[PDB]
Amino acid sequence: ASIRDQLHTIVYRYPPTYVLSSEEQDLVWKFRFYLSSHKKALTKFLKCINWKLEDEVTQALWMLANWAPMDVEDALELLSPTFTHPQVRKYAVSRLAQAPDEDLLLYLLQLVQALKYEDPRHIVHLHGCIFPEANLCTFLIQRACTNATLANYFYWYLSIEVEEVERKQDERAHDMYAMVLKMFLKVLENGNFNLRGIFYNLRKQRRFIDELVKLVKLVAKEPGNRNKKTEKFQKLLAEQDMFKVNFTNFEPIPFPLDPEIYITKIVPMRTSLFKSALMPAKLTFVTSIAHHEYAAIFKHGDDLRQDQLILQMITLMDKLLRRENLDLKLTPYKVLATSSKHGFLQYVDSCTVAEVLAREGNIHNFFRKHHPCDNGPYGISAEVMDTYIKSCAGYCVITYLLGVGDRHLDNLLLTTNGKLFHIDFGYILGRDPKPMPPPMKLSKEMVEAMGGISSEHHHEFRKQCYTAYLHLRRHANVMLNLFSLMVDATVPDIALEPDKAVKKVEENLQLGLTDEEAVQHLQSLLDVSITAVMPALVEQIHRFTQYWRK
Amino acid sequence: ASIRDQLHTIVYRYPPTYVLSSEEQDLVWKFRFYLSSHKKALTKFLKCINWKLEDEVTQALWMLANWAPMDVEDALELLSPTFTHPQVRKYAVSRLAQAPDEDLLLYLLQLVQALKYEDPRHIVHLHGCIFPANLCTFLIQRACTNATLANYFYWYLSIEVEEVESVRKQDERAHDMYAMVLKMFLKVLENGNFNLRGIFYNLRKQRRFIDELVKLVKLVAKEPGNRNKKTEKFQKLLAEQDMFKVNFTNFEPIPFPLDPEIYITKIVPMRTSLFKSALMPAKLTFVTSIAHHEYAAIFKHGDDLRQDQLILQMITLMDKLLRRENLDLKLTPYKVLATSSKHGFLQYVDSCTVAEVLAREGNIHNFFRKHHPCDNGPYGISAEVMDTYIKSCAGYCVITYLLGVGDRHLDNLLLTTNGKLFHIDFGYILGRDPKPMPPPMKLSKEMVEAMGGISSEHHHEFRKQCYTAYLHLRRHANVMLNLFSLMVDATVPDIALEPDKAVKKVEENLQLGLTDEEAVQHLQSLLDVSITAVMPALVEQIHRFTQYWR
Ligand SMILES: Oc1cccc(-c2nc(N3CCOCC3)c3oc4ncccc4c3n2)c1
């Protein structure tokens, strides 16, 4: 009662999923009802009661109903499969309903998956309701209709989900999605003006995509030099009237990738093509207002669902940091897959580090080209350097938590500002083609760019990682919930060892460690990675190795 | 404000010897007058005042007398030469007098050192008193009070009094002073009463015995052969009665110089071995006065152990602090004394040197296993032994590290059957090394393997232990620093090269600046490079990491 209070608070604050204390769940039970007061306790409380099969349920329902209001994130656990019960899911949905729309968007990528979880009966009921002779799905529709950008992402997520059938229960989940998608569209058609308007916009978007897909297929079909493929791409765009849509100009359409931006046309002349063998295209665009141009990318080869989830994760983590009042200048570009084997990727001006290095031997020469200050730490303006150290820190930390693999100098990008970002996300959760990842992913060039291990800045960088680590850990709970829901995603790296995937993210979190311990541990990974990269730190270890041999 | 004290709590509690305090002196001044919070505060207050005014001294003196009484260790700082004042030295001695003999003997090696610093006019005056200030009178008086103290005091003086006759400048001047002190002490004992005369007779015997022992060692070295033939000769000489002014096979009992508490009779000639080391020390057994419990010691003819005794004093003290703390690592801090230089004894703790252990069983585990086997125990080894070894290991790297002992190799570490490990033979201190190199931390692959590789409850446990050990020693810094200050003119070789740097060097290794969290991080880092360079697998892992990037 007196000191055990503290053991409760540590249990409520700390774990996202627990084996422990099933007898102590009964102990939570004893002090539960009285210490109903605070929300996170509620979710843990809901966990134990259900375990005892029958009368517990009725007693817990009242308990829940009276309980201090469950936070939005805790709700993400309830849509998840682990809780089956029908009423609790309703309450979890009530909780989402309380959340504003932006939160809804990120969560939404997860909630679409989250549909896979019951009840099938609900969907069939609604289907029969649209034509004759959970609460959640209906909720998603209603709110999906309420906001147009929201409607767009919803739609696209559904179309990818339905697209193909191939191992056994994937077919049944698919069948469920198709009906939900069809309902959604039918409600738009039955709709008051704004819905009808959003719908026509979706058909507009649909049409546009397929006509561009046909164009791309035609560009791929011709054998080619790299250059002739870009030229053919360019001429094809300019040939208005050999496609149902004419690409040099058409009706203002809201961009699928970024719905709040309308586009009229592409500019053929400006379109350039990317070096990677599966060849991504950059198209310049024209927008409804002040003829602003949008640059985006269209990739025809493979599945962006992975790339996009990882960006959702980054986007989320940046938002959390800034909410913790930390901004490391991460660049989380939007990514959408239209369908498997094609999507758009927001383009942000960048030079691939390898290209920076090819173009200029040193990274600093590069920055000094764009921003010079005479007293500035190195030829550069102080702010550019500072922002570069910051970007690195966030990115190593996230890469670490995400076990992003395959990183190399073509993968890291640099801007004139100094933000550093990562580009390609084929390898996730420790997957790597190479045999042994470094724990942390660092380039000799990047480290020399911080002024080396023996540098003032380099220290600031290290400092930043640690703190980023500590903060990200605090909001462990959201990320884990999202990943729990992303088990059946169809991201390849999740698909190989799905059950295990979430544990892998949590292992990077080292949530078991107290904070001093965590920092030390991360200190370790930096040390090894950095010694590995540096030519002199290795030479030194060698001389130390020598020592004992005589 | 209220913070005034907070800036002050940091000044009184944190630095052991500061150049730093400059302006601070005046603010301390304003506040000391109403409150003398602590014993520790007095050392701090004292630093600023004495030279500057003849009058200042009078105001400070009344402050000091009514001031809360200083802790003994802090007094050592006072005797250190910097404070010139006749009145403060008297104060320091008054504090020492209150301190119990055992603490007093521990420190004494330094006090013998302190004499040079205390003003000579006082010593000549005391001399005048006998044949035809306070500290010297105090050492002689207390020395007479306790026999062991007398014995240690005598030996320390003899070594310093015994001349090189290759004296330059003030060393020429100091010898006469030490010689005078010894002469005075010897005259007080002869003159003194029943008990003092008793001490004098015992010392006469100790002196007579050594010279006779030494004649024998010189005869043995002169004789030609490999180690075994020389040992055979040594054995014969002991047993030859009355070839010497003493009969080694039996004698009148003499208080052992290494432990005054136990007399010996006879050596046992056959029970004597010789060591692998360069100027092979004998071991002897002895008999002793009771139930013939043997004792053994070493006797080393080759070099001056003044330095070895200082290092062991350090370890003896540190162990004491930790046991005080209730952190007990199974440290072995064997008694050395020097004799008058180029002889000494060392207490013998029965141990096998690691190199020996590696040759006799394949590796350390095999060896503990042979002496202490428990099927269920960690490595089939009784739990206790592993634990004593983890701890012995931690205690030693940390202590070795603070003291910058160098030139460690397999001949240099040893084990016990209980598990403990220790070091030995420290010719190199404060980072003198024959090799151009660190490791910053001295570990052997063999020992890491002994802990069952990098991940083990045990290795991790070893690491855990080092940090706790590091923090406690950090806490008790002042005492160590004060003893080194007193050893500036020590005539210990490692100290000599730059006498001033020596105090700075331990202070620096000590790492006092950093917050504990940073101190632990700092220590963790050193262990990590030391361990990677010592494990072959770790180096391969780093190569894989360097190659990731190419
Ligand atoms: O195959 C893929 C999958 C995912 C991303 C890309 C991609 N994105 C890029 N972005 C450019 C800068 O703005 C943000 C996005 C990108 O820039 C490049 N520059 C050179 C080579 C390849 C790429 C490249 N590949 C390529």
Ligand SMILES: Oc1cccc(-c2nc(N3CCOCC3)c3oc4ncccc4c3n2)c1
């Ligand atoms: O040059 C020095 C200085 C100080 C100590 C030694 C030394 N001590 C030793 N002790 C034996 C075990 O109990 C503790 C004492 C010692 O044992 C050895 N066994 C083999 C070679 C050298 C030594 C060796 N050297 C050698």
